[PDB]
Amino acid sequence: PNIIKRSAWEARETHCPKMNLPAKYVIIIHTAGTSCTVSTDCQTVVRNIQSFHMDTRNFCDIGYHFLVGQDGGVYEGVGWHIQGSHTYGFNDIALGIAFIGYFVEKPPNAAALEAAQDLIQCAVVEGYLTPNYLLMGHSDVVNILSPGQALYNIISTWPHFKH
Ligand code: NA
């Protein structure tokens, strides 16, 4: 897919750690904030995410390698060659792809989903991602207690658990 570069959304220039390529994992994330369905709005959101990550979160740059808007566009975060700040303990081996929006109740539209799969496939073709890469959701990294793990299963039987 034709990637919308940092220059397009007027990203703040930085000098961050380099990425270890090819990446071996793809971690899907959602920004959990507002979505965007037209390019101009997506550029604004991406720019504001970079500012928040840097100024408030103290990250070196925006934490995602790429972001996907519901305009069907793929937006360069830090890109292929820069380390992410999206999932601690995996930022230099995992490509963090974040869907712009909140997708708990509804999924991103077909345009966004297809753009994401196209990006992942292209990553392998170009050598940015290993052909035997592991795809997972943000919560799937083992250090984040999640469903299926022994401890999670036990606390899910405790009072007040999600109710
Ligand atoms: Na986990």
Curated annotation (Swiss-Prot):
Q: Which organism is it from?
A: Homo sapiens
Binding-site residues for peptidoglycan, renumbered to this chain: H53, R57, Y64
Tissue distribution is: Detected in skin epidermis, eccrine sweat glands and ducts, ciliary body epithelial cells of the eye, in small intestine, colon, stomach and in mature epithelial cells of the tongue (at protein level). Highly expressed in skin and esophagus, expressed also in tonsils and thymus and to a much lesser extent in the stomach, descending colon, rectum and brain.
According to UniProt, the name of this protein is: Peptidoglycan recognition protein 3
Per the database record, which ranges form the N-acetylmuramoyl-L-alanine amidase domain? Answer: 22-147
What does the entry list under GO cellular component? Answer: extracellular region; membrane; protein-containing complex
Q: How is it modified after translation?
A: N-glycosylated.
Signals that turn on the gene: Up-regulated by exposure to Gram-positive and Gram-negative bacteria.
Partners and quaternary state?
Answer: Monomer. Homodimer; disulfide-linked. Heterodimer with PGLYRP4; disulfide-linked.
